[PDB]
Design a binder for this molecule. Structure first.
Ligand code: HEM
Ligand code: HEM
Ligand SMILES: CNCc1cc(C#N)cc(OCc2ccc3ccc(N)nc3c2)c1
Ligand SMILES: CNCc1cc(C#N)cc(OCc2ccc3ccc(N)nc3c2)c1
Ligand SMILES: C[C@H](O)[C@H](O)[C@H]1CNc2nc(N)[nH]c(=O)c2N1
Ligand SMILES: C[C@H](O)[C@H](O)[C@H]1CNc2nc(N)[nH]c(=O)c2N1
Ligand SMILES: [Zn+2]
Lengths: 407, 411
């Protein structure tokens, strides 16, 4: 029950003990592996608090200390009285960094300890949320020299007073359904582009309209806000070889800022915790541009390359996919916006794995998500066995607000 | 219990009921997923229920469940077991068995073809020379002058585990690999260890970059013997590129017949330790893995160089670019020579259709996403977006230890 993992490219074997700390459940059994599935009170709360504080106080080398026991007592009393508890700033920052550290699907985790945590637990209104969010966006963007950040809004109370960012990311392009049949802009956000409009948003109906923020405070009706255009760093996409590439009329935003997840720390639930780092190239060029249910521009590109698009056997899609991804990187690098290629990021992750096994006893990792969506086996992670398990603190999926919101 | 899988590109949902028939274990638990881990003498005690489960399946398939033919067969197997401590499959059962082991192979993307398998019954074989003969005929039939035909040859089942039949090669056709004293490797690095064994057994190695390895064959638990496959039976394809004319000068070729020979076939508790099987290649097996894995021929750099690519920074995607051209070349050469091959877009698309058809008619299709998704261009193939359930059904193909690690030497 002390498990080993092998890298088949290098024969390096690591031994995992960290998994024995794990608490939550995978969805798998002895009889069935669900590794490729996308999604899996007072008495409940105190053991959850205890586990977290034990982790926290061990990490600062004061396990079994006055301070530790005192803090344990104080939280215990606050729970019994208030039916919840409040985290100290130091605990909050610790919890946030470890939620990222524990994200088994994140390839970018080597950077986990350098996260800028913004405490937004004093926020009361959507206008406040907006202000906190603009500050996040401007700080994280940093004129192209990106910095990882998370902004944490007040924690859940009774599920009727939830703070929520309705957007899936702070910055995303609209998608509008055309009468001619297809789809203009980003098909992923068609339902959301609608709700914004269904709420008052005047859509320029372009291919790349930055969506408004739809912010929800204390459980009230969400409100639209337009992010100041000068806070939205965008990169026009050109190819370092194909001069016709620019005419495609493509651009993307610099800041990937996921806003729909739930942060769990010591039993406490933060339903609104937008976080951001910087892009791996393939996220945009492979998935965003080339997924069928997204921008799906592959055909257009191959056409302009004049490739034999007659038989799949010519691998025109593969050839085009590469060039597109070359362009994304080139463009971002040219405009001095932080981006990482999949080779660099996966090599970084192997090292990070090494570090975590060495200093922590393991590193939970979801191979299905860690291996990039192109050129899989020529990246070192493909040949790396990984053990997937759920540690806490964590980022969790949560239901879409518009299915839950008691209007 | 019913389980649902979702294709996130088409929103198509399928319902699995077949996972209930699952017997073996996955390696996973409620607290840990081992989905990316590469690897996961029987007694009369535990043998009859395994026979029975298989015979129940077999007789259901032919719609004679509960028939007198069914009941008598069960009886016959039972007496034979408790009398002889094992049993013999009928030809019909053996053929069904082999096909279903392939059908159940969760890591195999080519399973649309499962019902079209040529089963060669080699259970009357007694010596390595006889093995060589059966294997020669397999290769000849399977190759069919480039028009490949799926086939499997099944040698006698295990008895006491002391008289095992084994093919010591990992595949029937594979290239030698030679560790040089300077640390560099000549030929296929994957085959270095096996190559050394062959040489030690008396193989006279030509020491080239593409030497077809001899067959090393063990019958009835005796020491293995060397055999050279007749070269006119080994179909090979020179690799060239449809636009790059220097590509031929790399000196590359590959063999046309992928024929895996080191797995164990399990049918109704019986273990067939020698059961070589073959289909035809998906292009990326050769082009991505065989040529471009760092631990294999590893030709990305030389190809990148001849392409004059920006090789100073990985963000130029010179590795990605070279990889695609090599795979174009592999596919081109095979089609040009009329040797059966399938590209990864075609194969994955076929798999989705197969999988849907299997859910509908069988109640499921066990699949290992980690292996099903191609090693290049993952998300632009439809399997990437397909949720899959992995579980182990029998009959099945299983890993087994390398024979040089377990073999008791006679001399
Ligand atoms: C700093 C550079 C970062 C890089 C290069 C990076 C990279 C990635 C990539 C490529 C994915 C797969 C995304 C997809 O396919 O949709 C991912 C997933 C994820 N990332 Fe990171 N990331 C970074 C920073 C962060 C930060 C700061 C956090 C949180 C504070 C984070 C948390 C996560 C989580 C929770 C997932 C999985 C979400 C899910 O389960 O769907 N990442 N990351
Ligand atoms: C006819 C054309 C076939 C194609 C195109 C095909 C395709 C593939 C591919 C690409 C793999 C992954 C191999 C790797 O990456 O190492 C695989 C795995 C596998 N195939 Fe098929 N296959 C075919 C026929 C067959 C046949 C005839 C059998 C047996 C009768 C079979 C049984 C298996 C098994 C057991 C695995 C898993 C190997 C493992 O677990 O290590 N396949 N297949
Ligand atoms: C449509 N994809 C599924 C998905 C769902 C959810 C949710 N809920 C979050 C997701 O987040 C992906 C993610 C998260 C954090 C990131 C940080 C940096 C970065 N470059 N990409 C990053 C990507 C993805
Ligand atoms: C070292 N690579 C991992 C591996 C291990 C073993 C074993 N034991 C078998 C393997 O078989 C892969 C396989 C099996 C059957 C195939 C049939 C056709 C085909 N084109 N490829 C096919 C590939 C692979
Ligand atoms: C560690 C990992 O499971 C291992 O490298 C696997 C990944 N997926 C694979 N998929 C296929 N088809 N063939 C392989 O050899 C592998 N290797
Ligand atoms: C079906 C499968 O679970 C789904 O397509 C997953 C596969 N792997 C992925 N990997 C990453 N990094 N991101 C994804 O969205 C997905 N999608
Ligand atoms: Zn699992």
């Amino acid at each position: 029950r002390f498990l080993k993992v092998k890298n088949w490219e290098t024969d390096v074997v690591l031994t995992d003990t960290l998994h024995l700390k794990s608490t939550l459940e995978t969805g798998c059994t002895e009889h069935i592996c669900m590794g490729s599935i996308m999604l899996p009170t007072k008495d409940q709360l105190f053991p959850l608090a205890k586990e977290f504080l034990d982790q926290y106080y061990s990490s600062i080398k004061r396990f079994g200390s006055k301070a530790h026991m005192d803090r344990l007592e104080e939280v215990n009393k606050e729970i019994e009285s208030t039916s919840t508890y409040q985290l100290k700033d130091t605990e909050l920052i610790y919890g946030a960094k470890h939620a990222w550290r524990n994200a088994s699907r994140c390839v970018g985790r080597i950077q986990w300890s350098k996260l800028q945590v913004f405490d937004a637990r004093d926020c009361t209104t959507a206008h406040g949320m907006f202000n906190y969010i603009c500050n996040h966006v401007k700080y994280a963007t940093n004129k192209g020299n990106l910095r990882s950040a998370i902004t944490i809004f007040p924690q859940r109370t009774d599920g009727k007073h939830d703070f929520r960012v309705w957007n899936s990311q702070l910055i995303r392009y609209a998608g509008y359904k055309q009468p001619d049949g297809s789809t203009l802009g980003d098909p992923a956000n068609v339902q959301f582009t609608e709700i914004c409009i269904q709420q008052g948003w005047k859509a320029p109906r372009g291919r790349f309209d930055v969506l408004p923020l739809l912010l929800q405070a204390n459980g009230n009706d969400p409100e639209l806000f337009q992010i100041p255009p000068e806070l939205v760093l965008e990169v026009p996409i050109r190819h370092p070889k194909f001069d016709w590439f620019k005419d495609l009329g493509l651009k993307w935003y610099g800041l990937p800022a996921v806003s729909n997840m739930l942060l769990e720390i010591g039993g406490l639930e933060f339903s609104a915790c937008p976080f951001s780092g910087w892009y791996m190239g393939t996220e945009i060029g492979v998935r965003d541009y080339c997924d069928n249910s997204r921008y799906n521009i592959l055909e257009e590109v191959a056409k302009k390359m004049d490739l034999d698009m007659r038989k799949t056997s010519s691998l025109w899609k593969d050839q085009a996919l590469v060039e597109i991804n070359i362009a994304v990187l080139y463009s971002f690098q040219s405009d001095k916006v932080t981006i990482v290629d999949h080779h660099s990021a996966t090599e970084s992750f192997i090292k990070h794995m090494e570090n975590e096994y060495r200093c922590r006893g393991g590193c939970p990792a979801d191979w299905v998500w860690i291996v990039p969506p192109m050129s899989g086996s020529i990246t070192p992670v493909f040949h790396q066995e990984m053990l997937n398990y759920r540690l806490t603190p964590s980022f969790e999926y949560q239901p879409d607000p518009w299915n839950t919101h008691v209007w």
